[model samples]
Target chain A: IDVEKLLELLIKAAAAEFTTYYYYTILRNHATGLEGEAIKEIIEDARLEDRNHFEALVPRIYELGGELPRDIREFADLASCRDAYLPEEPTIENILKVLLEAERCAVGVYTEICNYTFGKDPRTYDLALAILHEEIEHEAWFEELLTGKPSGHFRRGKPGESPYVSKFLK
Target chain B: IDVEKLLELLIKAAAAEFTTYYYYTILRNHATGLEGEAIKEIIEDARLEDRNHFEALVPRIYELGGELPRDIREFADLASCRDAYLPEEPTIENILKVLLEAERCAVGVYTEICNYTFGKDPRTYDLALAILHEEIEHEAWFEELLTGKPSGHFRRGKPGESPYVSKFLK
Candidate 1:
C-alpha cells in the first residue's frame, strides 16, 4: 500500500465523517414536530454512527503516521460531501431528502476507500468495510423512510454499537 | 464493588452518551446562519466527543459482563440527563443555553461515576475521569460562549482526541 496516499484517503474519509457528524446535527435538529419525530430518531442513529466512524478512523490514521488538520474549519472544508444545511422550508419531507443525500454521499465516500484499501492494508480495509456496512444501512434507513418503504431494521440494541467495527475498538 | 451496580451505572452512562449524541445533533443542526456557525462547531466538538465517550464505555461494560439494552428507544429513555431538544425559537443564544445545560448534566453524570469507581475500579475510574475531563471542557466551551466570556480554549487537536482517555484506546 502507498502509505502517503492511503493516509490522504483516510484523512478525507475522517473529514467526511467529521463533517457529516456536524451537518447531520442540523438536519436532526430540524427534524421536529410530530411528523418529525420518527425521522429525528433515524437521523440520531446515523449521527452517532458517523461520529463512531470518525473515532474508528482516527487511530488508524495515527498508526499510518497521518496527521489531522489542526484547524476545525480546515478539517470541515476538506470533507468529501457538501455540508448538509437545512432546507429553506425544513419540512419533514425536505429534511428527509437532505438526510438521504448525505447518506448517499457517505456511501460513495466509503466505497471508494474500501476499494482503495481492499487488499493492500488489511486493517484499514477491515475498518473501512465495517464503516461501509453501517453507511449502507444508514442510506437504506433514510432511503426507506423517504420512499415510504418498510425497513425491517429497527434502531440499534444500543446507539452506535458498531457491531461491524467492534474489532477496532479496545 | 458490586458488578451488577457498576454494570447498571455503565449502561446508564452509555445511554446518556448515546442520548446526548442524538440530542446534540439536533442542537448542532439548528445552530445555523452566522451566529450559529461558531456555536455549531463547538457543538460538533462535544457531539463527537460524546460518541467517543460511548465507545470508550461500551467495552468496559462488556468486559464487566454488562449488556446494552436490546432496544434503542429504551436505551435513550434511560439517559441520566433530560433530552436536549432544540429551542422553541432556535436562536443562537437559545441553542447555546441548551448546549450548556446538556454539558453541565454530563459533567455531573461523569463526576459522580468517577467518584463511584475511583477506589474499587481503577480502570473504570481512569476511563470515567478521562471522559469527565472532556465533559468539563465541553461545559466550559458552551458556558464561555453563553457568557460572552473569554476562556483560553481551542478546538481539540483532533476531533475527540480523548487526551486523558488515550491510554484506554487500542
Candidate 2:
C-alpha cells in the first residue's frame, strides 16, 4: 500500500533474484574436471535463468523507489534468512548441495511472499504467485534429476553425514 | 507480516506433515508381506517422525489462529503438496521413490515460507526454516533407500530411456 512497504517487498524479491544468480555462478565456477562436467551444464543453464530473474526485478526495484542492497555483503547476510548453502569444501557434491539449497531458499522466499500477500494485496499476491511457480519449477527440475538415482540423495555435512539435514526425519 | 498469511503457511506446512503421516501409514500397512525387515524398519521409523511433524504443526496451526482443512475432500486435494501416491502402484521401491519426491516438494514449500518471513517476521521465518531442514532430511532418507547399489548411481529411468549424460554430454 505504502511506498516503503512496496519498496521493501521489491528489494526482498530483487535480493532473491540476485542471490540465485550468485548460487549458479558459484556452482558453475566451482565445478571442475569430470565431476564438474556433470553439473556444469545444469548450473550454467540455471545461472542464466537466475540472471533473468534478477533483470526482471530490477525495474520493479527502481520503480518502487527502493535502493537495492548495493554490495555482496547483503547477499551473504541474506543467507541466514534464506537457505545458506555453506559447504565445508568445494566439491561437486557440495556444489550440488548448494544448488539444492539455492532452489530451496528461492522457494521459501516466493512462498512467503504469496502467503503474505494473498487476498489482501492482489497485485503482490499475483507477482508472488508467478515467482512461487518459478521456484517450484526450479525445485522440481532438481528433484526430477535426483529421482533418477536411488542412491542419489544429497547431504550437506560430511561424507557419511547428511550434508543436507532436515528436521522432518528426526 | 499479517496473521492471516502466517496462518496460511502454518496450514500448508501442517498439511505437508499430515500427508507424510497418511503416506507413510499407507507404506507401512502395504509392507504387509515383504523381504528385508531392515528396509521395513527404516520406513516405519520415518513414518513415526512424520507423525511427529503432523502433531507438531497441528498445534502450530492453532497457535497461528488457523485450522486444518478438515474436510476429507480438501485433504485429498493436497495429495501433490503432501507427496502422497496410490499404494496400488505396488512396489516397495516405487513407494519410497514417490515419498522421496513428496519430501522434496515439502522442503520446497517450507523454504518459500522462510523467505516470506525473512527480516519481516523472524518467528515465522525460523519456524519455516526448521521445517524446511527436516523436509530435506526426509528426502535424503528415502533416496538412500531407493538404491541398494553401493556405487550410488542408478540408471534412474527405464532401461534404454536415453540417459541425461548421453543427451547432455557436450
Candidate 3:
C-alpha cells in the first residue's frame, strides 16, 4: 500500500469530519419543531464523533506533511458526501431519511478506511472502526425513532424549533 | 395595495436579519481573545436588530392573514442570505469581508423587495424602507471595514479579510 495514497485518504476523511461538525451545528441551530429536536439530538451526537474523527486524522494529515486546512472553504469543498439533507421543515420520515443517509455515508467511509489500513496502518484502522461503530448505532437510533421506538439508553430532550432557516439553502 | 406581497417582503427581511444574527453568534462563539469579544458584541447588536425585524414583520404577517414561516427551512429558503459564519481561525479582517458580502446580499434582497412592494402597498413599502435603512447601514459598516476605515467607536476593529468556507464544509 502506498503510504502517500493512505495519507490522501486520511486527509479527505479529516475534511469530511470538519464538515460534519460544522454542518451539524448549523442544523442544530436552524432546525424547527419535533423534527428539529430529533435532528438536533442526532447532530449533537454526530458532532462529538466528528471531533474524535478530526483528532484521529491529525496524525495522518501531519504525517503527510500537508498544512492543516486553514481555510474553512477548503474543508467544505472537500466534503465527500452528497447532500441528502432534507428541508428544515418538520417531516419525520424525511428527517429520518436524511439521518439514515448521512450515517450510512459515515459507515461506508469508515468501513473503507478499515479495509485500506488493516495491516498497513493499525492506529488509523482502529480509529476508523471506533467511528464506524458509532455511525452504525446512530443510524439505528434514528431508524428506531422514526418507528416510534426508544433509542435505548439515549436520553431524549426538549422538542423545539429555531426561529429561522438553515444556511445550506442560500 | 396587495398586503400579501408586503407580508412576503417582511418575512424575507426578517429572515435576512436572522441570518446575520446567527452568523455573528456562531463566529463569536468559535472566536478567540479580543477578536472574539468584538464579534460577540457585533452579534449582540445584530440580534437586537433581528428581533426588531421580526417585530416589524409580525404586524404584516397577521394583517395580511399570512402565516409567518415558523419553520426554519421554509423561512431560510425564502431568505436571500446564506449562512456566513467562518471557521475558528477566521481573522478579524476575513470576518469583516465575509460579513460585508452577507450584508451585500441582504441589501440586494431587501432593495428588490422595496421595489416589489413600493406603491403596491404604502404601509408595507414604508416598513420595508425603514428596515432597508438599517440593512444599508450594515453594509456600509462592512464596507468601511473593508477599506480599513473605522466603523465608529463601537466596533473597535477596522475592515479585514472575509472568512473562507468550503461547499461541503457548509
Candidate 4:
C-alpha cells in the first residue's frame, strides 16, 4: 500500500481505538449490580487494551510521517466505528451488544491494516497483527457473554497485559 | 536496586495498574449527568492509560525475573490504591473524590519506583518516568475538575495518547 494511504488508514484506526476507549468506559460505568458487576471487569479489560492499540499505533503513524489531528474533535469524528454511545435503554445485554459490535469493528480495522502492511512494512505489519490478536480475543469475550455460551473466558492476569503487543514496546 | 527488589515492586505496580483499570471504569460509569458526561471522558482517558502502564511494566517485570500471580483475586488484592468503588449516592462530587484519591496513589507508586530505579536502571527509569508524566497529568485533570480551577485541560487527541511515553514505544 502507498505510504500516504497507509497513513490515512493508520490515523483512522487510531481514532477508532481512541473513541472506543471512551465509549467502553461509559458502558462499563453503567454496568452495575450483579449482572453489571460481573461484566464490568471484561469491559475494563477491553477498554484498556483498546487504548494500548492507540498507543502502539501513534509511534508508527509518526514514524511513517503521519500526523495526528491536533483537534480532538476532528480525530474522534474520523473514527472507523460508529460512535458506541450507550444505548437508550441500558441493559447488560445491550451493553454487551455495544461492546461486541465495537470489538468486531476493531477486528476489521486491524485486519485491514495487517493485510495492507503485509510483505511491505514489517514493523506496521507486526504491530497490526499484535493488536488484531487482542481484538479477536476481545470479540470472543463479549460474544460469549452475549450468547451465554461457555467459552472458558476469564479476566486477564493483569489488565491490558498485552502479551502479544508488549514485544513491540522498548 | 537489587533485581529481586525491583521485581517485587514491578509486580505490585502491575497489580495496581490492573485493579485501577477495573476501578476507574466503575468510577467512569458512575460519573454521570450533565456534569458526568464531561468527567466520564477524563476518567476513561485515565483508565485506558493505566492499562498501558500495566502493559509497559509487565515486560520489564519478566525481564527482571518476576512472575505475575496466577490468581486474579490475589493480583487485585495487591493493588497499591484503595478500591475506588462508586459511592453510595454516586454523585459527581463523590466520583471525582474517588478518582482524585486513586490518581494520587498512582503518583506515589510511580514516584517511588522512579526513585528506586534512578541511577540504577535506565530502561526502567525511563519507562516509569513516562508513566509518571501521564499519571501526574491525570491527577491534575481530576483535581482541576474538583476545584473548578478552569485549567486549560482538553480531552486527548486520541485516547491514552501518551505524549511522554510514546517515546518509549518503538
Candidate 3 lDDT over A1-170, as tens digits, reads 78777776777776676556544544454456765665666666556666555645554555455544443445456767754444656365665666677777877887887898888777666666666765677777777767766667464343212111111111
lDDT string for model 1 (B1-170, tens) is: 88898788778877778667656644655566877766656677777777777767866876687655533345556778877766678788887777788788878888887778777888888888888887777777877777878877976656666677777764
State the C-alpha lDDT per candidate: 0.73, 0.56, 0.59, 0.75
| Higher-scoring candidate on DockQ, 2 or 3 | 3
- Model 4, position B25, has a per-residue lDDT of 45
Error of 2 at B119 (Å): 1.7
Best by lDDT: 4
After superposition, the stretches of candidate 1 with alpha carbons farther than 4 Å from their true spots are B1-170
**lDDT per residue as tens, model 2, A60-100:** 45433455566877744543246445477987566666667
At residue A27, give the lDDT of candidate 1: 66
lDDT of 4: 0.75
Model 3 lDDT, residue A69, Cα: 44
If you assessed candidate 1 against the hidden native complex, which CAPRI class would it receive? Answer: incorrect
TM-score of each: 0.52, 0.41, 0.44, 0.52
Candidate number that wins on TM-score, 2 or 3:
3
Candidates, ranked, lDDT: 4, 1, 3, 2
**Per candidate, chain B TM-score?**
0.91, 0.71, 0.72, 0.92
The reply for model 2, stretches above 4 Å from the true place, is A1-170, B32-36, B69-83, B87-89, B148-170
